[PDB]
Design a binder for this molecule. Structure first.
Ligand SMILES: NC[C@H]1O[C@@H](n2cnc3c(N)ncnc32)[C@H](O)[C@@H]1O
Ligand SMILES: NC[C@H]1O[C@@H](n2cnc3c(N)ncnc32)[C@H](O)[C@@H]1O
Ligand SMILES: NC[C@H]1O[C@@H](n2cnc3c(N)ncnc32)[C@H](O)[C@@H]1O
Ligand SMILES: NC[C@H]1O[C@@H](n2cnc3c(N)ncnc32)[C@H](O)[C@@H]1O
Lengths: 257, 257, 257, 257
């Protein structure tokens, strides 16, 4: 098949990349970074995220696989010394799909896909937005911001905000808070919220209408924002898996020992 | 159909019960607390939980409905003044099903069903158990205890422990911690964990083998425990719904205003 | 004595201000916003903070007092209807002093005073700084930022970050975290830290050297930062108190009912 | 001086004890476990706590020192290999004092001292008590229980409950919550509270009057309880220190690396 390889750009990763290409040359694998079926990322989860966003247009045609030159990542879960074993099995593997988050921003409209999360903060503060779930006004949020995470993203930013870790087989999204003000006056739920497919969470401005919005590593200031809509994407990311590496096992290795 | 009515036992609830029965007498509704198809609970969520456990043997034949004489509950979501409207619609409604938690306790075996959660604490402390997910040892927990919650239960005990609130349409279970010790020596994940169907969480003793185990309001001391197994039950609870009362709307009314 | 009055600037507060001045005219109270002994703030805690910073140069010569035209504040603790009673007692009161936080920023030096807190975030992220206590390297922080709060400030930003509320009679400062990354790799204490007088907390850059630093409402981007030093200030703020309004009672009224 | 030595009771500690005694025999140090001036604990913090409670009657006459045969403790901060160096310096050192917590229990009265904390839970639940600070009703607590920690105790149970770590030079006490219920109905402060000297926190029963009360390792069920009073003790514990081992350095070694 057609394949491409992105690299963290450090000496370690660039040289490992040139080796897999050479090993791939010993097969009928046409390198093609235009319309690849196999996308290999060498570096960290940050490198993988970039690889994902480079090709978010052809997710249903691509099977991703990540190699970590540094510490064990959640997407880059295969060790550098397994490279030669990878180049073989990719030539002759089953696919694993994770849910994605669809974010829509309306002005006075733009959509994005996130593998980890999409967050919202204010350009200077204070940050005030009304939270609306399925058209029902749920709360008015006062604080630093909000984070909407995918299943696979719960181990990332979501985790640092006190959110729960959920298995990627669960088609859902999770909203956590950032330093929410809670008075006898102002009131937020406090707890993280987990939404199923087809549930629409909408954030609506109260005073200011400029927000610092991010999707994964991308962080854009958006002006004249009228609404921000979160919902579990219809599109899914496909991973090529050559071995059994259980999510909970990945969680254990990352956080426990 | 056959129906039965349990009451919190206070003057308010007992008299509301006698009225619905009388109103039910004006129809072809045979009162039968042996094999009822309709189980009505009048009181609070505590009354409802009892009603559920009285008939956990015939869940697939019963449609539950709760009336709250006190404050708005999550299971007892219908106001007392709607009683007469209830007795009518029940005579001629669609069913809503929530996931349940199956708990298994092995000795040197007993199973239970929970509508809210099952917890584990130690009889005198210290509490130490090994946590095993799908046969893989995940962590060794040191602290006060652990809580495994259903979707509908996340608004209860789970919530006070920092757990996330998840929609009851999601077939899953959530594990939270109780005052976990975290040293450079001892290590727990800290974050709540959300498991999908068919995932098995097993708790295994390290030193002591006696534990205070609860399922909902039931709290039993269990001796010579070898293992405690948690997994999303195959059985589901069925609610009779005569109106639209969205879960998130119930959450808003309960915690926000 | 000499006195001055600042106002939130809304119709309510401006008119209450003109009334107290007039009532003050019936006494020997020279209005002087250059070298006042009595500084009265009418509005909210935000108005009070501004009043404090307008005169942070003569704290030992000023006795502050706040009136809240909106909701009960912690510094603006006196109701609008008590204005006439205030103008009287100020003419003929005991002083209450709260500890302040001294922040020092060195380049390749500037000091500030805070009544609530001083925070540090990164200009674009990621935020990485080494935390050094009394010259001993304590940890390397990875996350969104850090907050150092005064005793009276613990009810503010500090509170939303999970920090503890401490009585203002305690000469100390408290450091809380903002979404700290905690891996098997990266490690922070997680818990808030409370330092006594004469303890010096120093934040030192690791990669980037530009930080968004705030003291109370003031938020300045600082470039080429070498060090940020936190320590309990030698200066204290003085309040004029005409009645008994216990801190814990203020906390109760603000957060409980 | 007179001295005594308690041991964890394991082979390691018992043999280290017999060695220090022998080394002490080479000096004019009369072993006396009745009225010792020097109390040495060999084991862990648990052993030290026991040593403290064995002699809580003569705290102002005793200087404690702890040796850890296992992992680094906060009270047992001296390594086993430093034993011979200890026996020398104790013969010819300065004292360090930490604040203690005084707990009073009234019936229809008994006092205790705690080095770490005193907690309150219910015998079967539910746990409901009114919290009263300096005679002012602050809140009505609904949940699992409450914990009142000393400065040195904040690194213990207090820490697992989300409490802040405070320096032992600060004469104060800190109250944290255990799984508190927070509805639109029931309301607790949520945040930990830090009280200075002379502040009295009183817990008063609402329905049940039986509570599981602990002070450090001691856990007693108390019946017919009318009130539980917490306040910073007038008594302090005295440590013999032969080197400089900063509290924050102890915290770093224990939790960071
Ligand atoms: N490389 C981009 C990734 O960095 C993660 N991130 C950003 N801020 C974070 C934070 N404060 N804690 C944990 N993860 C964080 C966040 O998950 C984002 O997708
Ligand atoms: N009536 C029994 C119900 O009481 C709930 N519960 C017990 N302890 C709790 C607690 N500490 N916080 C919130 N909910 C709690 C818990 O959800 C259980 O199912
Ligand atoms: N008027 C300025 C004051 O606003 C407070 N503040 C800022 N962000 C906050 C936040 N996210 N939560 C609670 N308080 C906050 C913070 O205490 C600052 O001193
Ligand atoms: N040896 C007795 C000591 O054990 C500590 N402790 C009890 N439960 C704990 C817990 N759940 N987490 C951390 N520390 C705990 C608590 O500090 C007590 O003083």
């Amino acid at each position: 098949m057609k394949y491409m390889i992105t690299s963290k750009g450090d000496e370690k990763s660039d040289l490992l990349r040139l080796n897999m290409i050479a090993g791939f040359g010993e097969y009928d694998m046409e390198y093609d970074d235009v319309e690849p079926e196999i996308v290999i990322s060498i570096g960290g989860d940050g490198t993988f995220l970039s690889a994902f966003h480079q090709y978010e247009e052809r997710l249903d045609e691509i099977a991703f696989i990540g190699i970590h030159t540094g510490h064990l990542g959640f997407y880059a879960d295969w060790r550098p010394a397994e490279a030669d074993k990878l180049v073989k099995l990719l030539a002759k593997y089953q696919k694993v799909s994770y849910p994605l988050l669809k974010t829509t921003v309306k002005y006075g409209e733009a959509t994005y896909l996130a593998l980890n999360e999409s967050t919202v903060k204010s350009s200077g503060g204070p940050f005030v937005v009304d939270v609306v779930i399925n058209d029902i006004h749920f709360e008015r949020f006062r604080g630093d911001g909000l984070c909407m995470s995918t299943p696979s993203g719960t181990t990332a930013y979501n985790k640092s905000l006190g959110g729960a870790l959920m298995h990627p087989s669960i088609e859902a999204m999770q909203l956590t808070e950032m330093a929410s003000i809670n008075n006898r006056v102002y009131r937020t739920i406090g707890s993280p919220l987990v939404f199923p497919k087809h549930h629409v969470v909408s954030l609506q401005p109260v005073n200011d209408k400029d927000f610092q919005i991010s999707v994964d590593e991308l962080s854009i200031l958006h002006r004249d924002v009228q609404e921000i809509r979160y919902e579990v994407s219809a599109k899914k990311i496909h991973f090529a898996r050559f071995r059994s590496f259980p999510f909970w096992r990945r969680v254990h290795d990352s956080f426990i020992e």
